């Protein structure tokens, strides 16, 4: 029953989705496109906090399995 571990990009997406949806007046394909473009353009230094969160969620998954 434990949820699968979340990738760095997914954790970041969760943090910003409300804002992109409000921007694009709830055009969901466009909000998702915009987020895809943004993540793809982000430098490693900007992705690092999300990489860390993804590493911790792998540990969360492992705890929950045991």
Domains in the chain: boundaries: 1-66
Q: Return the residue matching tokens 């571990």.
A: 5
H/E run at residue 5: none
Per DSSP, 1 falls in state: -
Task: Give pairs for 54-62: CB < 8 Å, separation 24+.
Answer: 54/5, 54/6, 54/7, 54/8, 54/11, 57/5, 57/6, 57/11, 58/5, 60/5, 61/2, 61/3, 61/4, 61/5
The answer to whether 28 and 21 have CB atoms below 8 angstroms apart is yes
> What is the C-alpha separation between 56 and 62, in angstroms, rounded?
10
φ/ψ region of 25 (left if φ > 0, alpha if ψ in -120 to 50, else beta) reads left
Note the CATH number of domain 1-66.
1.10.30.10
Method used experimentally:
X-ray
DSSP class per residue in 10-57? HHHHHHHHHHHHHHTTT-HHHHHHHHHHHHHH--HHHHHHHHHHHHHH
The structure was resolved to a resolution in Å of 2.0
> What is the C-alpha separation between 14 and 9, in angstroms, rounded?
9
């Amino acid at each position: 029953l434990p949820e699968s571990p979340k990738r760095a990009e997914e954790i970041w997406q969760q943090s910003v989705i409300g804002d992109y949806l409000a921007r694009f007046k709830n055009d969901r394909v466009k909000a998702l496109k915009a987020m895809e473009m943004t993540w793809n353009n982000m430098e490693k230094k900007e992705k690092l906090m999300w990489i860390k969160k993804a590493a911790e969620d792998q540990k969360r998954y492992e705890r929950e399995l045991s």
